[PDB]
Short mmCIF file of C-alpha atoms and ligand atoms in Angstrom, two decimals:
data_model
loop_
_atom_site.label_atom_id
_atom_site.label_comp_id
_atom_site.label_asym_id
_atom_site.label_seq_id
_atom_site.Cartn_x
_atom_site.Cartn_y
_atom_site.Cartn_z
CA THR A 550 0.00 0.00 0.00
CA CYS A 551 1.09 3.56 -0.70
CA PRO A 552 3.36 5.13 1.91
CA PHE A 553 2.26 8.36 3.60
CA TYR A 554 5.36 10.25 2.35
CA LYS A 555 4.04 9.83 -1.34
CA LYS A 556 0.68 11.47 -0.54
CA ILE A 557 0.02 15.31 -0.60
CA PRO A 558 -2.50 16.18 2.16
CA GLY A 559 -5.56 18.18 1.16
CA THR A 560 -5.35 17.19 -2.44
CA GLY A 561 -6.18 14.16 -4.62
CA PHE A 562 -2.41 13.98 -5.50
CA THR A 563 0.33 11.43 -5.24
CA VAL A 564 4.11 11.69 -6.17
CA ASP A 565 6.05 8.94 -7.70
CA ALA A 566 3.33 6.38 -6.60
CA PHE A 567 2.74 4.03 -9.66
CA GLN A 568 3.51 0.55 -8.15
CA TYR A 569 0.54 0.38 -5.71
CA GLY A 570 -2.32 -0.08 -8.27
CA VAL A 571 -5.20 2.40 -7.99
CA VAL A 572 -4.53 4.58 -5.03
CA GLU A 573 -7.69 5.42 -3.11
CA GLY A 574 -8.68 9.03 -3.62
CA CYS A 575 -5.95 9.85 -6.14
CA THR A 576 -7.19 12.08 -9.00
CA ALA A 577 -3.73 12.90 -10.50
CA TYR A 578 -0.37 11.10 -10.34
CA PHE A 579 2.80 13.24 -10.54
CA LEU A 580 6.14 11.90 -11.73
CA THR A 581 9.22 13.80 -10.67
CA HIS A 582 11.63 12.03 -13.14
CA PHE A 583 12.28 9.09 -15.36
CA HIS A 584 14.19 6.71 -12.97
CA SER A 585 12.82 3.21 -12.47
CA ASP A 586 12.36 3.27 -8.60
CA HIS A 587 10.01 6.25 -9.30
CA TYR A 588 8.23 5.18 -12.51
CA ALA A 589 7.83 1.50 -11.50
CA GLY A 590 4.31 0.53 -12.56
CA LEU A 591 3.70 2.79 -15.62
CA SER A 592 2.92 1.29 -19.13
CA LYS A 593 0.67 1.68 -22.19
CA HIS A 594 -2.28 0.43 -20.04
CA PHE A 595 -2.20 3.39 -17.59
CA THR A 596 -5.31 5.47 -17.95
CA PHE A 597 -5.03 8.11 -15.14
CA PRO A 598 -3.62 11.61 -15.75
CA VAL A 599 0.18 11.80 -15.30
CA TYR A 600 1.66 15.21 -14.64
CA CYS A 601 5.37 15.67 -15.42
CA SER A 602 7.99 17.71 -17.26
CA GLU A 603 8.23 17.85 -21.14
CA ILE A 604 11.37 15.63 -21.13
CA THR A 605 9.71 13.06 -18.81
CA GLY A 606 6.66 13.05 -20.99
CA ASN A 607 8.79 12.32 -24.19
CA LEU A 608 10.25 9.37 -22.28
CA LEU A 609 6.88 8.03 -21.09
CA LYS A 610 5.43 8.15 -24.64
CA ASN A 611 8.47 6.72 -26.42
CA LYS A 612 10.10 4.34 -24.01
CA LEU A 613 7.14 2.96 -21.89
CA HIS A 614 4.39 3.52 -24.61
CA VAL A 615 2.11 5.45 -22.36
CA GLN A 616 -0.73 6.97 -24.45
CA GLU A 617 -0.45 10.62 -25.28
CA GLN A 618 -4.00 11.56 -24.07
CA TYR A 619 -2.94 10.66 -20.42
CA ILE A 620 0.37 12.54 -20.44
CA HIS A 621 0.17 16.09 -19.20
CA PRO A 622 3.49 17.91 -19.57
CA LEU A 623 3.99 21.26 -17.79
CA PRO A 624 6.44 24.00 -18.54
CA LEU A 625 9.01 24.88 -15.86
CA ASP A 626 9.01 28.03 -13.73
CA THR A 627 5.26 28.61 -14.59
CA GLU A 628 2.19 28.75 -12.30
CA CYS A 629 -0.28 26.10 -13.60
CA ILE A 630 -3.69 24.91 -12.26
CA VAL A 631 -4.26 21.17 -11.73
CA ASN A 632 -7.71 19.94 -10.48
CA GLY A 633 -8.10 23.36 -8.97
CA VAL A 634 -4.78 23.60 -7.18
CA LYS A 635 -1.83 25.94 -8.22
CA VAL A 636 1.42 24.01 -8.94
CA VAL A 637 4.91 24.97 -10.18
CA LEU A 638 7.64 22.67 -11.52
CA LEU A 639 11.26 23.70 -10.74
CA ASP A 640 14.55 22.30 -12.01
CA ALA A 641 15.86 19.61 -9.54
CA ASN A 642 19.52 19.59 -10.78
CA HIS A 643 19.23 15.74 -10.89
CA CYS A 644 19.03 13.92 -14.36
CA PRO A 645 17.35 15.43 -17.46
CA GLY A 646 13.76 16.37 -16.98
CA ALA A 647 13.82 15.97 -13.23
CA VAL A 648 11.74 18.44 -11.28
CA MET A 649 10.78 19.60 -7.74
CA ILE A 650 7.00 20.37 -7.27
CA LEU A 651 5.52 23.37 -5.36
CA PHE A 652 1.89 22.84 -4.32
CA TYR A 653 -0.30 25.90 -3.08
CA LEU A 654 -3.06 24.30 -1.13
CA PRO A 655 -6.41 25.91 -1.10
CA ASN A 656 -6.25 26.55 2.68
CA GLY A 657 -2.93 28.50 2.39
CA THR A 658 -0.33 25.74 3.18
CA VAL A 659 2.50 25.60 0.68
CA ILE A 660 4.37 22.25 0.15
CA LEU A 661 7.69 21.64 -1.66
CA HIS A 662 8.39 18.04 -2.86
CA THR A 663 12.08 17.89 -3.98
CA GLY A 664 11.77 14.57 -5.84
CA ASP A 665 15.46 13.54 -6.26
CA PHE A 666 17.73 16.64 -6.29
CA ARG A 667 21.22 17.98 -5.87
CA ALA A 668 20.80 21.24 -3.84
CA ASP A 669 22.42 24.30 -5.31
CA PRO A 670 22.57 28.02 -4.41
CA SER A 671 21.03 28.79 -7.79
CA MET A 672 17.74 27.45 -6.34
CA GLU A 673 17.70 30.28 -3.75
CA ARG A 674 16.67 32.52 -6.78
CA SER A 675 13.83 30.69 -8.44
CA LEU A 676 10.06 31.07 -7.50
CA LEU A 677 11.04 29.60 -4.09
CA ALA A 678 12.44 32.86 -2.94
CA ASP A 679 8.91 34.55 -3.19
CA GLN A 680 7.08 32.70 -0.42
CA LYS A 681 7.18 30.68 2.75
CA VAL A 682 7.10 26.79 2.66
CA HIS A 683 5.27 24.98 5.47
CA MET A 684 6.16 21.36 4.57
CA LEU A 685 9.27 19.94 2.75
CA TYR A 686 9.33 16.36 1.37
CA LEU A 687 13.11 16.00 1.20
CA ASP A 688 15.54 13.71 -0.81
CA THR A 689 17.67 12.56 2.13
CA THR A 690 19.78 9.99 0.13
CA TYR A 691 23.11 11.39 1.67
CA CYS A 692 21.84 12.79 4.92
CA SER A 693 25.08 12.04 7.03
CA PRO A 694 28.17 14.16 7.40
CA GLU A 695 30.46 11.50 5.98
CA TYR A 696 28.98 12.18 2.57
CA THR A 697 31.17 14.85 1.11
CA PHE A 698 31.92 14.95 -2.63
CA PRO A 699 33.54 17.28 -5.12
CA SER A 700 31.59 19.62 -7.48
CA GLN A 701 30.48 18.15 -10.78
CA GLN A 702 32.82 20.60 -12.54
CA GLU A 703 35.96 19.18 -10.70
CA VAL A 704 34.98 15.63 -11.52
CA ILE A 705 34.44 16.45 -15.23
CA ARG A 706 37.92 18.25 -15.32
CA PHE A 707 39.57 15.15 -13.91
CA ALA A 708 37.82 12.87 -16.42
CA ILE A 709 38.57 15.07 -19.43
CA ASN A 710 42.32 15.47 -18.48
CA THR A 711 42.73 11.67 -17.81
CA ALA A 712 41.05 10.64 -21.08
CA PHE A 713 42.91 13.29 -23.18
CA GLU A 714 46.29 12.22 -21.65
CA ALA A 715 45.73 8.61 -22.24
CA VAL A 716 44.53 8.72 -25.88
CA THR A 717 47.26 11.25 -26.80
CA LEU A 718 49.89 8.80 -25.42
CA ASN A 719 48.22 5.93 -27.13
CA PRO A 720 45.94 6.70 -30.20
CA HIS A 721 44.91 3.11 -30.22
CA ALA A 722 43.18 3.26 -26.76
CA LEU A 723 39.33 3.06 -26.44
CA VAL A 724 37.54 5.00 -23.76
CA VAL A 725 34.39 3.26 -22.26
CA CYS A 726 31.81 4.87 -19.94
CA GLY A 727 29.24 2.83 -17.97
CA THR A 728 25.54 3.77 -17.79
CA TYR A 729 22.23 2.19 -16.48
CA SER A 730 19.74 5.04 -16.40
CA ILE A 731 19.48 8.53 -17.70
CA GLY A 732 21.69 11.11 -15.83
CA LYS A 733 25.42 11.89 -15.83
CA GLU A 734 25.50 12.43 -19.56
CA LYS A 735 28.10 15.20 -19.10
CA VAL A 736 30.69 12.52 -18.25
CA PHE A 737 30.66 10.85 -21.67
CA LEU A 738 29.79 13.98 -23.69
CA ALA A 739 32.69 16.02 -22.21
CA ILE A 740 35.16 13.24 -22.85
CA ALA A 741 34.00 12.78 -26.57
CA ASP A 742 34.17 16.59 -27.03
CA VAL A 743 37.89 16.79 -25.92
CA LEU A 744 38.77 13.76 -28.13
CA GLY A 745 36.91 15.03 -31.27
CA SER A 746 34.79 11.83 -31.37
CA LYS A 747 31.07 10.97 -31.14
CA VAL A 748 29.84 8.65 -28.46
CA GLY A 749 28.83 5.31 -29.76
CA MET A 750 26.04 3.28 -28.17
CA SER A 751 23.19 0.78 -28.62
CA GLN A 752 20.17 1.75 -30.60
CA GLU A 753 18.02 1.52 -27.35
CA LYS A 754 20.34 4.02 -25.63
CA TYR A 755 20.50 6.31 -28.65
CA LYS A 756 16.64 6.44 -28.69
CA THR A 757 16.56 7.29 -24.95
CA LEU A 758 19.01 10.17 -25.44
CA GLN A 759 16.99 11.52 -28.49
CA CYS A 760 14.02 12.03 -26.06
CA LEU A 761 16.04 14.52 -23.94
CA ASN A 762 16.08 17.95 -25.77
CA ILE A 763 19.89 18.23 -25.45
CA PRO A 764 20.97 20.78 -28.04
CA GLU A 765 23.31 19.57 -30.77
CA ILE A 766 22.84 15.97 -29.81
CA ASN A 767 22.82 14.63 -33.34
CA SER A 768 26.34 16.22 -33.20
CA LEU A 769 27.68 14.16 -30.27
CA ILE A 770 26.08 10.66 -30.29
CA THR A 771 25.88 7.80 -32.80
CA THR A 772 24.99 4.10 -33.26
CA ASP A 773 28.11 3.49 -35.42
CA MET A 774 30.55 2.11 -32.91
CA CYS A 775 33.23 1.69 -35.56
CA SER A 776 33.56 5.44 -36.16
CA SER A 777 33.70 6.24 -32.34
CA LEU A 778 36.47 6.04 -29.76
CA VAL A 779 34.19 6.66 -26.72
CA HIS A 780 31.74 3.73 -26.21
CA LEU A 781 28.83 3.50 -23.71
CA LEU A 782 28.05 0.06 -22.17
CA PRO A 783 25.78 -1.12 -19.38
CA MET A 784 27.17 -0.50 -15.94
CA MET A 785 27.16 -4.23 -15.30
CA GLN A 786 29.73 -4.73 -18.09
CA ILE A 787 32.33 -2.31 -16.45
CA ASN A 788 34.52 -5.03 -15.07
CA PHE A 789 37.70 -6.82 -16.35
CA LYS A 790 35.79 -9.79 -17.92
CA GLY A 791 33.18 -7.56 -19.54
CA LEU A 792 35.74 -5.15 -20.89
CA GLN A 793 38.18 -7.88 -22.17
CA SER A 794 35.19 -9.26 -24.14
CA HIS A 795 34.28 -5.92 -25.57
CA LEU A 796 37.86 -5.22 -26.73
CA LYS A 797 37.75 -8.63 -28.51
CA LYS A 798 34.69 -7.42 -30.46
CA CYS A 799 36.49 -4.34 -31.78
CA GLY A 800 38.57 -6.50 -34.14
CA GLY A 801 42.02 -5.20 -33.39
CA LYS A 802 41.17 -1.57 -33.88
CA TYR A 803 42.13 -0.98 -30.23
CA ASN A 804 44.73 -2.43 -27.88
CA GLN A 805 43.90 -0.77 -24.53
CA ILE A 806 40.75 0.29 -22.62
CA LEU A 807 40.40 3.20 -20.12
CA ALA A 808 36.89 2.84 -18.51
CA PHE A 809 34.88 5.20 -16.19
CA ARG A 810 32.26 4.15 -13.57
CA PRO A 811 30.49 7.29 -12.36
CA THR A 812 29.44 6.16 -8.84
CA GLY A 813 27.46 8.28 -6.35
CA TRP A 814 29.68 8.00 -3.15
CA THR A 815 32.48 5.62 -2.34
CA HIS A 816 34.42 5.72 1.17
CA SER A 817 37.58 6.62 -0.78
CA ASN A 818 36.00 10.09 -0.41
CA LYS A 819 36.59 10.09 3.38
CA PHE A 820 40.34 9.77 2.70
CA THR A 821 41.04 11.05 -0.90
CA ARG A 822 40.92 14.24 -3.02
CA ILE A 823 39.76 14.03 -6.68
CA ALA A 824 43.31 14.85 -7.69
CA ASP A 825 44.43 11.71 -5.87
CA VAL A 826 42.08 9.10 -7.43
CA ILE A 827 43.83 6.07 -9.15
CA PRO A 828 42.40 3.24 -11.24
CA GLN A 829 42.16 -0.51 -10.80
CA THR A 830 44.33 -2.01 -13.57
CA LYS A 831 44.68 -5.52 -15.13
CA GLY A 832 46.77 -5.93 -18.16
CA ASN A 833 45.79 -3.33 -20.80
CA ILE A 834 42.45 -2.45 -18.98
CA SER A 835 42.13 0.39 -16.36
CA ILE A 836 38.84 1.24 -14.41
CA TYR A 837 38.31 4.54 -12.70
CA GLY A 838 35.45 5.02 -10.17
CA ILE A 839 34.65 8.70 -10.13
CA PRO A 840 32.33 10.43 -7.57
CA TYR A 841 29.89 12.20 -9.91
CA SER A 842 26.77 12.69 -7.77
CA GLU A 843 23.33 13.86 -8.87
CA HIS A 844 22.19 14.08 -5.25
CA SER A 845 22.95 16.63 -2.59
CA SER A 846 26.06 16.18 -0.34
CA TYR A 847 25.21 16.53 3.43
CA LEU A 848 26.53 20.14 3.48
CA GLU A 849 24.61 21.19 0.29
CA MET A 850 21.42 19.60 1.83
CA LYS A 851 21.96 21.40 5.13
CA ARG A 852 22.53 24.85 3.44
CA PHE A 853 19.24 24.46 1.38
CA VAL A 854 17.15 23.54 4.36
CA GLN A 855 18.64 26.23 6.64
CA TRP A 856 17.89 28.79 3.87
CA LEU A 857 14.29 27.54 3.17
CA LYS A 858 13.35 27.21 6.82
CA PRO A 859 10.39 24.79 6.53
CA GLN A 860 8.07 24.29 9.48
CA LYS A 861 8.00 20.43 8.98
CA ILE A 862 10.45 17.99 7.08
CA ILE A 863 9.28 14.65 5.73
CA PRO A 864 12.21 12.52 4.49
CA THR A 865 11.60 10.44 1.31
CA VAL A 866 14.85 8.35 1.43
CA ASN A 867 16.39 5.95 4.08
CA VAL A 868 12.97 5.80 5.89
CA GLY A 869 12.92 2.02 6.27
CA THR A 870 15.01 1.64 9.47
CA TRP A 871 14.47 3.22 12.90
CA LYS A 872 18.22 3.93 13.26
CA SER A 873 18.19 5.87 9.91
CA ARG A 874 15.15 7.73 10.78
CA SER A 875 16.34 8.72 14.29
CA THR A 876 19.71 9.85 12.79
CA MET A 877 18.08 12.05 10.16
CA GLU A 878 15.69 13.71 12.82
CA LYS A 879 18.67 14.47 15.06
CA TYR A 880 20.35 16.34 12.12
CA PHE A 881 17.15 18.27 11.27
CA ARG A 882 16.93 19.48 14.97
CA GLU A 883 20.67 20.55 14.87
CA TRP A 884 20.09 22.48 11.66
CA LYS A 885 17.05 24.27 13.08
CA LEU A 886 18.87 25.19 16.33
CA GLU A 887 21.93 26.38 14.65
CA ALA A 888 19.89 28.59 12.17
CA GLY A 889 17.30 29.88 14.79
CA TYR A 890 14.03 29.02 12.98
NI1 LIG B 1575 16.69 9.42 -9.26
#
């Protein structure tokens, strides 16, 4: 049955609640982004209204075959009316088409649901600045002080410099990047741009990327693997066996692989600077795990909440254990006492 933290009080609305069958009293189902833990349950047989971003709506139609008459895309940063309630969609700085949702309840309560997000000071100047928020449904993925990670910009600099150096030293090296959902496209696109190559990939993955409104995408991606020196493979294949096998398939065009696994966090972060990251190597294969996160660090999350000053926080992640829940509630209290709300 649907958990309380997916229900918006005082409306007929749910958020990211598609795996519970027909939710009792739900008149409109919102989807914050196209990741499988959130969309789980949607298909061509869904006949309730789905409200989402334009990009998420492209993906529902093309990848899951949801019928167009039930997809209701909304523009960002625009006040819209849904079943008599004002809503706004804001950029979540997660994966393409990911949004936060502001709901303006008829009785005066204002609720922000972050979906999945990576908090950023740029958010402190959207339509959020313009009113008070009473309840925050918060993406608490990394809500513990051990979770520090570098900026996205520092991580991409490291990747670009690493790949450019390797291929310049050996023009017969192949770069591989792992993927299993949308998100983190900058990793493979920045590397291909510095190498003067397109990124080669499966037809299924190319179709997925063509749904995303990325400008100049016909310019950066391709299904012709033979013309590309940056290949995308499933994340599961980014290991020594999987990569040895791929290299065999390239028919002696290449004699070395440099591979990237963009992870969220890895406890190498508690000891190591980005500058200091080294690969795992076997033979002519090296694998770099890089800490490219599309969720808030603890400090980014804390700054956002201490700026917003909500009256009540409802965590949406790590809510399944009493120890996790208790830990998070203790940090929320600290934040509030330190800031004075
Ligand atoms: Ni997500």
